[PDB]
Design a protein around this ligand. Sequence first.
Ligand code: 155
Length: 245
Amino acid sequence: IIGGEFTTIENQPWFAAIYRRHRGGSVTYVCGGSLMSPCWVISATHCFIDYPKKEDYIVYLGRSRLNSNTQGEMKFEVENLILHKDYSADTLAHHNDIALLKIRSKEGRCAQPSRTIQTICLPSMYNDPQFGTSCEITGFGKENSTDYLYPEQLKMTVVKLISHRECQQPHYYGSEVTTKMLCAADPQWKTDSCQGDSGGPLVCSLQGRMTLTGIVSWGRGCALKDKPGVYTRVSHFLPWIRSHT
Ligand SMILES: CC(C)C1=NCCc2ccc(NC(=O)c3ccc4cc(C(=N)N)ccc4c3)cc21
């Protein structure tokens, strides 16, 4: 995240941190996830499109720091990895960038809810907040583009959603942003999402309830003028999310 505030998992009980083991031993961090139900998690496919092996990942439902066992955590494995069957990635625009990582502990169990481990809500057919609506995003991503190290503590920020036609202007994304994408950003461009926060939760507060509206996907740079962050329009994929769970 760029700027923003340092939070803790207790404030984002549905945030899952996805790791990957290497042939050798080392374990580095990959992307962010959202817990939909005990046995499931939803992210983005570009995080896994290069190593489609389920045995390669590790997910955390309760970790505050990147190299620490923040009280109350639980370690998981990926029982099933379902990628959207038509993913493609252009120069910037990432098509059908949504995925499913069915978790399971070594004993064979799913997520066990607590003050720290909870889940967010699925949207409904044709119902996304109207532009201008502020929402939040959580992630261990970069703080400044000019870095090579992810922040040792989880961060969070607020951004405003932008209309479709506004994000489709020439000095923005043009026609590289379809209807199945959302755009959001600080109107002063000081805070934003960046590499590492990919695949994380874009939570808007729709109708009193917190909802997983977007999914960190792509974006030109990080916090650049007239260059919002793009997100997958979660709602649209209801008949998909549904038919595979
Ligand atoms: C693992 C890496 C190299 C990788 N592999 C598959 C293809 C691929 C696509 C995008 C990325 N992610 C990024 O590098 C990447 C870069 C910039 C990003 C910027 C935003 C944003 N502007 N809010 C939001 C998300 C962002 C993600 C990495 C890969």
